[PDB]
Amino acid sequence: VRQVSKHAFSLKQLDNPARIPPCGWKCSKCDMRENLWLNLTDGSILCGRRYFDGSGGNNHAVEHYRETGYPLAVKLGTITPDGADVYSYDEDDMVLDPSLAEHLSHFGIDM
């Protein structure tokens, strides 16, 4: 079972966030329109990491975590009323975010 993040009840989300619509996303740093991760601190939309077999993206979301420390990201296209795929860069694991509806509503997203 995925464990609840240590950040789920303490996450600081930045002021004056930009709204995120329900589709049309692109990585800000490359052409990818799939495997995109919404950082829950700042609403950045950046591609997933590259793996040893060539799978995955161009590491833009994990690069962004390394620059900012902003720990949680949600995989766009996985959000339903019951949850989403949430990764914690700080905790090195997929995690549950019981505050995900609040965190997504910060960006105008209705789970």
Tokens linked to 17 = 């966030």
Question: Could you say which of 3, 28, 55, 105 contacts ligand ZPV (CB under 6 A)?
Answer: 55
Binding partner at 87 among Zn ion, ligand ZPV, none, C-beta below 5 to 8 Å by kind: ligand ZPV
Find the shortest distance in angstroms from Cβ 12 to ligand ZPV. Answer: 20
Does 67 contact ligand ZPV by CB under 6 A? no
Question: How would you label 80-96 residue by residue, b for 16+ Cβ within 10 Å and e otherwise?
Answer: eeebbebbbbeeeeebb
- Residue from 36, 40, 49, 58 touching ligand ZPV (CB under 6 A): that is 49
Tell me whether residue 75 is exposed, middle or buried, using C-beta atoms within 10 angstroms of its C-beta: 0 to 12, 13 to 18, 19 or more: middle
Terminus-to-terminus CA distance in the chain, angstroms? Answer: 21
Give the footprint of ligand ZPV on this chain (CB under 6 A): 37, 48-49, 51, 53, 55, 61-62, 73, 87, 94
